[PDB]
Recover the amino acids of this structure.
């Protein structure tokens, strides 16, 4: 049903990213078969972006807002909350479900 949050280790229960917030977030991205396509942890570098304003995939906009600082989780994004029917040429096959193991490090 779109984006689903599989909770692994809990956040602080208080600080949740809101629309327009900057988040600092480690992620490991895998395709529906288990193969990694991207990883901020292999670059030793958490990613930073603005949540809820249309700049990341829908699964992150509707999914990262459900986490609190410190939390580990998996966002399971079906293709309509990711790269859709065409996919991402070279990287993401069409209609793919994507699986992001994420850790929310900080909100601003
Ligand atoms: C000049 C632009 C390059 C610029 C690249 C960076 C800043 C480096 C940054 C680590 C991205 C990665 O570079 C290693 C690499 O990350 C992926 O592997 C990936 O894990 C992914 O899915 N992520 C990254 C983590 C957040 C969720 C999602 C994303 O939303 O990413 C965003 C994304 C592509 C959203 C599109 C935007 C267009 C909409 O139409 C579409 O809507 C469906 C969704 C990224 C951050 C963009 O906002 C900014 C950029 O693209 C992509 C598979 C391909 C992407 O490289 C291109």
């Amino acid at each position: 049903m779109g984006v689903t949050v599989e909770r692994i280790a809990p956040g602080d229960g208080k600080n949740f990213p809101k629309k327009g917030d900057k988040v600092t977030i480690h992620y490991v991205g895998t395709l529906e078969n288990g193969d990694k396509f991207d990883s901020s942890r292999d670059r030793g570098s958490p990613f930073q972006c603005t949540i809820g304003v249309g700049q990341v995939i829908k699964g992150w906009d509707e999914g990262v807002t459900q986490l609190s600082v410190g939390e580990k989780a998996r966002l399971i994004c079906t293709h309509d909350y990711a790269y859709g029917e065409r996919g991402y040429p070279g990287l993401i096959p069409p209609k793919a479900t994507l699986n992001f193991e994420v850790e929310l490090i900080k909100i601003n």
Notes: The helical segments are 58-61. The two ends are 29 Å apart (CA to CA).
